[PDB]
């Protein structure tokens, strides 16, 4: 009988949080930003098309020099591309073809991958031998790995379908911190610019803000009817965007703990696979399941433009760190660079 | 190549070497036959995995060869976290080998005593078969533990698992009725053929049945490619 009283106490605390959020809701973002002139028609153009994958491409990550691309496919190979010349720099054979995520190191020395094998494999690119070698295989998750990100060379944030999130140390090979509290499978990770916080998107329609140093959950977000597929931080680090299977993107405030804005259209009914921002933060780029990407005005909710030219489900969107180009990967086994 | 420097041209040559390696690996991979192994936990799929093999958690891959044809069997039993968020990865597979046991009807489910195990296997089969990703993918159904089913069916009638069933207590009639119900679960009768087999002690017979079903699937795919249909 203590369970019912404790549940009632939890309901009272949730009512307190809802009342606080309602009290802070002084104005709407759409009411404030009406004075801002719109961005107009943003017409981007394909400049480079990358070819060589044969199966479905699932993930891509940009380097910090805005020139190198890691791409992951169901062929069981990672491909490191040169974006300015379209040349292939590396082709890494994988021990398992069921890879759903990939990341590139900020230093550029390592590439990690993972998927249904429940193992996160980290590859050393800089060697005194002309072969990329498996540096470390990380194990301990029971569910499928959804996203992997690097805080630095020696630390990895890895989320999976066992509802948890693990911080990993390469040298020891043992997980240092385990983040728990999700009640559903975790699909995406967004890493803060200062590398002190990360936000996790899960199937239970709650996006949680985590502190990597402390190891405790500090903030929780809601308001999605369906599963959260992709999440991206705003450049300052005080807001983030969330994509879902409800054909809606939501801009959430980190400081006020509130849903700032909703991006939705009546004709669009298909789900969302990738979410990314521009360098300034004015254009939100989302890749949908009706085979195209939409560029949304972040502060006015208007559709700024449509990027199209893929023949199958758009899977992944990278924006360069200097903001020059947008790379789009999809299930037609092609990567397209847009400007 | 006039504007390109020497290191740029050598990078182009390295890229062409990588492209030829990718093309050869793709040509080698395309010939291999991929089979997705599904079923309940108590279905006894490990027995057939033992049989096919002759001739830590995650996807268990089994490579074998038969009549100069290479088969890759993918077992997803280890991960019970989700079924909706990764099964689209398996969209391009030649066939799904779905295994259920016939001795499951007397045994109730461990998690919930009220729910029967065979009905859980039927809901599993209905969800997998009527999935939007596998509209063209064939199913090879294996009915395991037929001897245990005979020993159970003599002691206990089938009326426990099926309320609305009037039929003779004969082993063949009961097995035929179970096969008929599993086939009736299919809602795609013009795009998806279901192949049913009763598992035998002999290793060769099950592999021969899988080889014949895969041959029929490849012939249907070639006929679709040619444009006769």
């Amino acid at each position, epitope marked *: 009988s203590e369970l019912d009283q404790l549940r009632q106490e939890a309901e009272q605390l949730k009512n307190q949080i809802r009342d606080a959020r309602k009290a802070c809701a002084d104005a709407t973002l759409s009411q404030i930003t009406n004075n801002i002139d719109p961005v107009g028609r943003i017409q981007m153009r394909t400049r480079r098309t990358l070819r060589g994958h044969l199966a479905k491409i699932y993930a891509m990550h940009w380097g910090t020099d805005s*020139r*190198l691309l890691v791409s992951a496919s169901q062929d069981g190979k990672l491909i490191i591309w*040169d974006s300015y*010349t379209t*040349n292939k*720099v*590396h082709a890494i054979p994988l021990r398992s073809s069921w890879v759903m995520t990939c990341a590139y190191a900020p230093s*550029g020395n390592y590439v990690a991958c993972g998927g249904l094998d429940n193992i996160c494999s980290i590859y050393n690119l*800089k060697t*005194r*031998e*002309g*072969n990329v070698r498996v540096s470390r295989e990380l194990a301990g998750h029971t569910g499928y790995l959804s996203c992997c990100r690097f805080l630095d060379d020696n630390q990895i944030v890895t989320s999976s379908g066992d509802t948890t999130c693990a911080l990993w140390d390469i040298e020891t090979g043992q997980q240092t911190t385990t983040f728990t509290g999700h009640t559903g499978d975790v699909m995406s990770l967004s890493l803060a610019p200062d590398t002190r916080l990360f936000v996790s998107g899960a199937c239970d329609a709650s996006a949680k803000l985590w502190d990597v140093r402390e190891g405790m959950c500090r903030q929780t977000f809601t308001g999605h009817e369906s599963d959260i597929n992709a999440i991206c931080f705003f450049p300052n680090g005080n807001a983030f965007a969330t994509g879902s299977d409800d054909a809606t993107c939501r801009l959430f405030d980190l400081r006020a703990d509130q849903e700032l804005m909703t991006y939705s259209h009546d004709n669009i009914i298909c789900g969302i696979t990738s979410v990314s921002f521009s360098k300034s933060g004015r254009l939100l780029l989302a890749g949908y399941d009706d085979f195209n990407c939409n560029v949304w005005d972040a502060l006015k909710a208007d559709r700024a433009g449509v990027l199209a030219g893929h023949d199958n489900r758009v899977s992944c969107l990278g924006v360069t760190d200097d903001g020059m180009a947008v790379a789009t990967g999809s299930w037609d086994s092609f990567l397209k660079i847009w400007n | 190549g006039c*504007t390109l*420097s*020497a*290191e*740029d041209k*050598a*990078a182009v*040559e*390295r890229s062409k*070497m990588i492209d030829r390696n990718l093309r050869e690996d793709g040509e080698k991979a395309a010939r291999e036959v991929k089979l997705l192994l599904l079923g309940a936990g108590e279905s006894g799929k490990s027995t057939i995995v033992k049989q096919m093999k002759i001739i830590t958690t995650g996807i268990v891959e089994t490579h074998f060869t038969f009549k100069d044809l290479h088969f890759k069997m993918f077992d997803v039993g280890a991960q019970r976290s989700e079924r909706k968020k990764w099964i689209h990865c398996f969209e391009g597979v030649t066939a799904i080998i779905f295994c259920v046991a016939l001795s499951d009807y007397d045994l109730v489910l461990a998690e919930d005593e009220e729910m029967n195990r065979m009905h859980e296997s039927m809901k599993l089969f209905d969800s997998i078969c009527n999935n939007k990703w596998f509209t063209d993918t064939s199913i090879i159904l294996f009915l395991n533990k037929k001897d245990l089913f005979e020993e159970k069916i003599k002691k206990s009638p089938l009326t426990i698992c099926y309320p609305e069933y009037a039929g003779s207590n004969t082993y063949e009639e009961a097995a035929a009725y179970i096969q008929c119900q599993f086939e009736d679960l299919n809602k795609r009768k013009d795009t998806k053929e279901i192949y049913t087999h009763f598992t035998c002690s002999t290793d060769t017979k099950n592999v021969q049945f899988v080889f014949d079903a895969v041959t029929d699937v490849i012939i249907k795919n070639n006929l679709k490619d040619c444009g006769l249909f």
Partner: single-chain antibody, 230 residues
Framework: VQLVESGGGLVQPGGSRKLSCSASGFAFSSFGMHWVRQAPEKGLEWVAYISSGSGTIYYADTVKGRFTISRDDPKNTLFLQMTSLRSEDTAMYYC??????????????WGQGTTLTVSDIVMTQATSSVPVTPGESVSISCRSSKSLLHSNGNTYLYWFLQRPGQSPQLLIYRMSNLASGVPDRFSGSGSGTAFTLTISRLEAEDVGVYYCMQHLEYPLTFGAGTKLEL
């Protein structure tokens, strides 16, 4: 990482001699390979290049029609077949490893070389002898005959160190990068035709002959070499 050159010795003029280099400890099939020759007192001279896939082969103008390069990948060996040998061919023969992609560092590893005894962009490197007390920074100037700044912003300049009794070690590649395993004391800069190698805090290990190399276009040319005495 190891390269062992065999053969060598005393050859009568007009004879044919075969050099075999054995590669160990690395993936031989991915690297391009070079042959470099050093006379007893003269500077380094380029001889031949074979690609990783054996698709393109280049020879120096002097060695065309006499030297044949061959790449045996499953045995991890290089063969250089020599015919119509003459007095100039007498030299030390080094096998050089190279790798070519964006961000790579070719000319990284050098072999020990064999002694064979028989019985274009011009790189200017003037100051042969430099008498500076150790502990003071030294500049080394390498003038090029034409601009090495390509349209893609990369300037193709290489700085090598050959200390006495050892193989030439790579120090600086493309003038903005430092070779792996080399201390941060070495540095370099340039304007596209005039080039500067700056060495701070001279130690006893830095005694040797520095070399300047152009990689803009074939044939590859070397500088005369500056000698540092400490």
């Amino acid at each position: 990482v190891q390269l062992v050159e065999s053969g060598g010795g005393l050859v009568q003029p007009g004879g044919s001699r075969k050099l075999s280099c054995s590669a160990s400890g690395f993936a031989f099939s991915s690297f391009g390979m070079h042959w470099v020759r050093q006379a007893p007192e003269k500077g380094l001279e380029w001889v031949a290049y074979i690609s990783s896939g054996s698709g393109t082969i280049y020879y120096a103008d002097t060695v065309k029609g006499r030297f044949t390069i061959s790449r045996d990948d499953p045995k991890n060996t290089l063969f250089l077949q020599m015919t119509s040998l003459r007095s100039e061919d007498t030299a030390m023969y080094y096998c050089v490893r190279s790798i070519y992609y964006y961000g790579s560092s070719p000319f990284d590893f050098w072999g020990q070389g064999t002694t064979l005894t028989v019985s274009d962009i011009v790189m200017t490197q003037a100051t042969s002898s430099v008498p500076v007390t150790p502990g003071e920074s030294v500049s080394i100037s390498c003038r090029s005959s034409k601009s090495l700044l390509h349209s893609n912003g990369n300037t193709y300049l290489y700085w090598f160190l050959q200390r006495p009794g050892q193989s030439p070690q790579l120090l600086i590649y493309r003038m903005s990068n430092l070779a792996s395993g080399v201390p941060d004391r070495f540095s370099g800069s340039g304007s596209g035709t005039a080039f500067t190698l700056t060495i701070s805090r001279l130690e006893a290990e830095d005694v040797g002959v520095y070399y300047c190399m152009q990689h803009l276009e074939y044939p590859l040319t070397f500088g005369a070499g500056t000698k540092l005495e400490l």
